[PDB]
Design a protein around this ligand. Structure first.
Ligand SMILES: Nc1ncnc2c1ncn2[C@@H]1O[C@H](COP(=O)(O)OP(=O)(O)NP(=O)(O)O)[C@@H](O)[C@H]1O
Ligand SMILES: Nc1ncnc2c1ncn2[C@@H]1O[C@H](COP(=O)(O)OP(=O)(O)NP(=O)(O)O)[C@@H](O)[C@H]1O
Ligand SMILES: CC(=O)N[C@H]1[C@@H]2OC[C@@H](O2)[C@@H](O)[C@@H]1O[C@H](C)C(=O)O
Ligand SMILES: CC(=O)N[C@H]1[C@@H]2OC[C@@H](O2)[C@@H](O)[C@@H]1O[C@H](C)C(=O)O
Lengths: 362, 363
C-alpha cells in the first residue's frame, strides 16, 4: 500500500508532502514541497502566543492551511500521474500552535474532515493526543520510525532531527528506544536573523560563522532548566523564543549581533551534543535530518563536539534529510490502520504503547 | 447486534446524557444514565461560547474536565448494567459545541476523543459535524437521519421536533427526501431569562411564562429577526440568540413585567417552530416532540393550539423517551461511521451530498 504524509513543522518554511510504499520496507516514492505563503505564516505564528479570539482565528487559519495541503497533494498526484484511489491514506500531523505537556495538552490544527473532503483520500490525523492522554510528552514521535529505518544490532546510533526544534532518537542495541527534544534547533538562529536583517534563515550558518561566541551569554542560555532535565522531555516556542533571548541579553551590555548569532549556533550544538552523549555516551554515528543538516557551520560544530562519532546527514543512508518528518507521518498512518503502536514509552513517558491518530474516512 | 454508547451534552448544559443501544435490524434503547453538569464546568463552558482571551489554553483545560466527567458517566452506566467495556463496539461522542459559525464555514465541538478513548478503553467516534460543513453544509441538525430511521412512515407526514436549548425539526414527508433545520430558540432564552431574573435554571412546566401576558409588539419585533424569515437549510445557536439579543429588543418597548417577557419568549419559541414547520410541511399529520422542551407543559399546549391540523405529542407516545433521543442519535452515528453509511441528510444541511460523518479514535 501507498501512503501520503503531510508535515508543516515549527519553522513554517513550507509544507512537506511525501509518498511512500510500505511493505517489508519503507520506500520513498515521491515528494513535493510548497513554500509557506507569508500571510499564512504570520497568522500561524500569531496563534503560537496566547491572544484574543483564538477559536475563530484558528478555525479560519486552518481552512487556509488545509486548502494549501490539499493543493500540494493534488500537485504531487498530478506529477506522479496517479489517482487519489491509489493512495490508502494520508498521515497528517497538522500544525502545532500550542504544546503544554506539563498541563497535559498539545494543539495541532488542520481540520482533517476538510482535508478528507478536498483530497478524496482517508486521513489519519491528531497523532500526539493519545500519547499525552496516557501521561506522555506527546513528542517526539519520529523515534518509532527512526527505529524502523535505522535500528542496527552492531551500531550505537543517534538519529538527530534539527528542525526549528532539535530532537534525538537513541538507537542502542538491546535497549528500549529513547529520545527527547534537545532544545532549539534553527528557531532562534532564524528568529535572530529575521529580527535583525529580515532574512528567513542564516544561509549555511555564514552569519553565525562571521561572529564570535560570547561566553557569558552562552553560559546564561545553557543554564535554562530545560537543558538540565533528563529522560522524556519536549519543548516549543512556549520556552524558546525572542522574548526569552532578549531577557538574557538585557542582563549584560549590548553585543555585536553576529556574536549573538554565533552564540545561538553554539547553544544549539552544545545542548544537542551534551544531551545526546549524556544519554548515549558510546554513540558511534549521528544521522542528521531536518533542514539544520544544511547549516554547514552547525554541522561542522556538531562533528567537533562529538569527535567519537561520525556526524553525517541521512542522505548518505538513502533518506533525504528534508523529507524524514513527512515520511514519519505517512508511516504513522500505516501504523494506525494496522493497529500497531506509534509511540515509544521510554521516549515520551507514556504509560505504555498506544495506537496514535484518528481516521477521517473519505 | 452490536452495542453502542452515545455521549451528548447539548447547548443547555443541564448535564451529560449517556445512552446504550443495541443496533441489530432496529435500534433498541438498552440503558441510559444522566449526570448533572457541575456548576463550575457549566460556567467554564459557557465562557467559551463567546469570543474571549486565551481560548486555546482555556478550551484544552476545560475539555480535560468534560472528558473526565463523560468517562465517569460511561463507567457508572457500565457498572449499573454489570457490563464490561469490551461489550461495547464504540462510543459516539458529539462533544460540546462552543462555537457554531455556518456562514464562516466552521463549527467547534470540544471533547478530546483520544483522552475519552484512553479513559474508557472503548473505541470513540467523534467530530461528526465537520465533514458535513466541509461539504458545504450547515453541520446541523444531524438527528434527521436517525429520526428517519426511527419514525419514517410512508403513510403519514410526520415532523420530529427536538426542543432543547435550540429547536430543530425533521420533516419526514412520504416519497420525499428528509428535510429539516433549526427552528430557533428552544429553551435557551426562557432558561436565560429566568436565571437572569431569579437565579432559576429553568421555568418548570412553563408556569412562570403562563402567569405572564404575551406582549404582541415585543413578539413581532423578535420574530422580525432575519433568521426566522430564512427557508431551506439553516442552523443557529448562542451566537444569534442570547440575552444581549433580547435586551436590544427590550430597549424598544417600555419597562415590561418580567413575567410578560417570559410569556413572550415562550410564544417566540412556539411561533418560530409552528411557522417554520408548517411552511415547510403544510401536510403535517403528527408532530413528535423530544428534548427537554417536551416537559414544558405550557409550551406543548401552545404548540398544539398553533398546529391544530397535527397531533402534537412527545416521542414517549411512540416508545422513545424524549430526554434520550439525542444521545441515541449519536450512538447510532457511531454505527453509521463503522458501516460507512452516510450520517448527514443533504436536503437538511445543504451539503453537496451524503457523507460519512465522524472520526475514529481506537482504544
Ligand atoms: N542552506 C541552509 N543553511 C542554513 N540553514 C538552513 C538551510 N536550509 C534550511 N535551513 C534551516 O532549516 C530550517 C527548516 O528546516 P525544516 O526541517 O523544514 O524545519 P521544520 O519546519 O521545523 N520541520 P519540518 O516539518 O521537517 O519541515 C530553516 O528555517 C533554516 O533555519
Ligand atoms: N419540567 C420541565 N419544565 C420546563 N422545561 C423543562 C423541564 N424539564 C426540562 N426542561 C427544559 O429542558 C432543557 C434541557 O433539555 P435538553 O433536551 O437536555 O436540551 P439540550 O440537549 O441540552 N439542548 P440542545 O443541545 O440545544 O438540543 C432545560 O434547560 C429546561 O429548559
Ligand atoms: C509539539 C511538536 O509539534 N513537537 C515537534 C517539534 O519539532 C521537532 C520537535 O519539536 C519534535 O518533538 C516534534 O516534531 C517531530 C516531527 C516529532 O514529533 O518527532
Ligand atoms: C452546532 C450545534 O451543536 N447545534 C445543535 C443545537 O442543539 C439543537 C440544534 O441546535 C441542533 O441543530 C444541534 O443538535 C442536535 C443534537 C442535532 O444536530 O440534531
Amino acid at each position: 500500500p501507498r501512503y501520503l504524509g503531510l508535515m508543516s513543522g515549527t519553522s513554517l518554511d513550507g509544507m512537506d508532502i511525501v509518498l511512500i510504499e510500505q511493505g517489508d520496507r519503507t520506500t520513498l516514492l515521491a515528494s513535493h514541497y510548497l513554500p509557506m505563503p507569508a500571510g499564512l505564516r504570520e497568522d500561524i505564528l500569531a496563534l503560537c502566543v496566547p491572544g484574543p479570539d483564538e477559536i475563530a482565528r484558528a478555525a479560519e487559519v486552518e481552512q487556509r492551511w488545509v486548502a494549501l495541503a490539499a493543493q500540494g497533494v493534488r500537485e504531487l498526484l498530478l506529477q506522479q500521474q496517479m489517482s487519489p484511489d491509489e493512495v490508502r491514506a494520508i498521515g497528517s500531523h497538522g500544525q502545532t500552535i500550542r504544546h503544554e505537556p506539563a498541563r497535559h495538552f498539545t494543539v495541532q490544527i488542520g481540520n482533517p474532515a476538510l482535508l478528507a473532503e478536498l483530497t478524496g483520500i482517508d486521513v489519519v490525523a491528531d497523532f500526539r493526543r493519545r500519547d499525552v492522554a496516557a501521561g506522555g510528552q506527546g513528542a517526539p514521535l519520529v523515534p518509532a520510525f527512526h527505529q524502523a529505518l535505522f535500528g542496527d544490532d552492531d551500531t550505537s546510533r543517534a538519529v538527530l532531527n534539527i528542525g526549528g526544534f532539535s530532537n534525538v532518537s537513541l538507537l542502542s542495541p538491546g535497549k528500549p528506544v529513547r529520545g527527547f527534544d534537545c532544545g532549539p534547533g534553527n528557531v532562534l538562529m532564524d528568529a535572530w536573523i529575521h529580527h535583525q536583517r529580515g532574512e528567513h534563515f542564516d544561509r549555511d550558518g555564514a552569519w553565525a560563522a562571521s561572529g564570535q561566541v560570547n561566553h557569558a551569554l552562552l553560559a546564561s542560555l545553557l543554564a535554562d532548566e530545560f537543558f538540565a532535565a533528563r529522560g522524556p522531555k519536549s519543548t516549543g516556542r512556549e520556552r524558546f523564543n525572542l522574548p526569552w533571548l532578549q531577557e538574557h541579553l538585557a542582563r549584560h551590555p549590548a553585543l555585536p549581533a553576529a556574536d549573538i548569532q554565533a552564540t545561538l549556533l553554539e547553544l544549539s550544538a552544545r545542548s544537542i551534543s551534551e544531551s545526546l552523549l549524556d544519554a548515549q555516551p558510546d554513540c558511534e554515528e549521528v544521522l542528521v535530518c531536518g533542514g539544520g543538516a544544511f547549516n554547514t557551520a552547525l554541522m561542522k560544530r556538531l562533528a567537533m563536539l562529538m569527535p567519537e562519532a561520525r556526524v553525517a546527514s541521512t542522505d548518505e543512508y538513502g533518506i533525504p534529510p528534508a523529507w524524514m518528518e513527512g515520511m514519519a507521518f505517512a508511516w504513522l498512518a500505516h501504523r494506525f490502520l494496522e493497529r500497531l503502536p506509534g509511540n515509544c514509552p521510554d521516549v515520551t513517558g507514556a504509560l505504555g504503547p498506544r495506537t496514535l491518530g484518528a481516521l477521517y474516512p473519505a
